[PDB]
Design a protein around this ligand. Structure first.
Ligand code: SAH
Ligand code: A1JOQ
Length: 269
């Protein structure tokens, strides 16, 4: 993968710096802003966690096997700073093995400290590994029950996507659940291109909808940009600048309804 070096370097700044920008829980793929969002926590932390929850409610409603004794091994593909690793360990205390995979070393070092200081090292495993290489993860005899792609697919070429889905198919039992959040154009990736790549690789889409709303995602980018303006006004950091560019330019594509955040719940055949 020739685009990995560019992905690694864009998430390379200190967690202390990123904390000011996206929240203390480091949720980095939008948020649901409804009556079940916690009003006590930072809007970004509460909405981001509420988005993950809402997606598991959609999955459950769509007929996915997400019961306590159905989830023995989960994988978080492009796990960022690790917010979903902690969330899975709490939602599934009897899940034996939660594997995070990421290409970003600084994200995994932070995730590693959080997992450790909350005594989750027993169950949560962190791998510096391209999503296309998940076929090389340990213990192939123990299949995946659950797979999360929270905002990770944007960074994938068609080839990496293909290889990631091939590899996950081979490592995932029939009926294992795939929970995907991604921003897609409705005219890089579209709903239909992603639907195709899933169905071409042994996955059935059982729920497919806009989530969160364009209104809510615009608001989420709002909160980020306010934090970016207050902490990095003078475009000192080229990575935070590039996030400002995206917050501005994608918010406008969302305003013109040229794109949306999509939830895809799929199921291994
Ligand atoms: N090919 C690849 N293999 C593994 N991780 C990848 C990847 N391409 C992108 N990523 C990771 O995908 C993540 C996307 S950002 C989203 C982070 C996290 N899922 C969250 O929701 O908070 C980044 O951490 C990036 O390093
Ligand atoms: C987890 C996240 C993601 C998966 C991100 C990337 C959302 C996907 C987006 C907007 C990628 C930006 O694409 P691009 O640079 O082409 O934007 P344009 O110039 O409008 O075309 C967020 C940074 C973050 C919340």
């Amino acid at each position: 993968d020739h685009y990995q070096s560019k992905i690694e370097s864009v998430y390379a700044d200190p967690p202390e710096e990123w904390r000011k920008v996206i929240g203390n829980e480091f949720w980095y793929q939008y948020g649901v802003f409804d009556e079940k969002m916690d009003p006590s926590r930072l809007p970004l932390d509460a909405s981001g966690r509420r988005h993950m929850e809402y997606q598991f409610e959609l999955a459950e409603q769509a007929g996915a096997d997400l019961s306590s004794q159905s989830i023995r091994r989960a994988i978080d593909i492009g796990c960022g700073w690790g917010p979903v690793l902690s969330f899975l360990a709490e939602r599934y205390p009897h899940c034996e093995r939660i594997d995070g995979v990421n290409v970003s070393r600084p994200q995994l070092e932070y995730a590693s400290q959080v997992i450790s200081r909350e005594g989750l090292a027993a169950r949560v495993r962190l791998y510096l590994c391209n999503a296309k290489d998940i076929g090389a993860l340990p213990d192939p005899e123990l299949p995946y029950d659950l797979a999360i792609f929270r905002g990770s697919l944007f960074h994938f070429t068609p080839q990496v996507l293909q290889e990631t889905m091939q590899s996950l198919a081979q490592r995932m039992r029939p009926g294992g659940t795939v929970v995907i959040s991604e921003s897609l154009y409705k005219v890089r990736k579209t709903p239909d291109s992603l639907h195709k790549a899933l169905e071409d690789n042994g996955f059935d889409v059982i729920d497919r909808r806009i989530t969160p709303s364009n209104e809510e995602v615009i608001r989420w980018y709002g909160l980020v940009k306010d934090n970016l303006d207050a902490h990095y006004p003078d475009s000192r950091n080229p990575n935070f600048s590039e996030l400002r560019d995206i917050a501005i330019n994608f918010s406008d594509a969302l305003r013109k309804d040229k794109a949306s955040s999509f939830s895809f719940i799929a199921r291994r055949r």
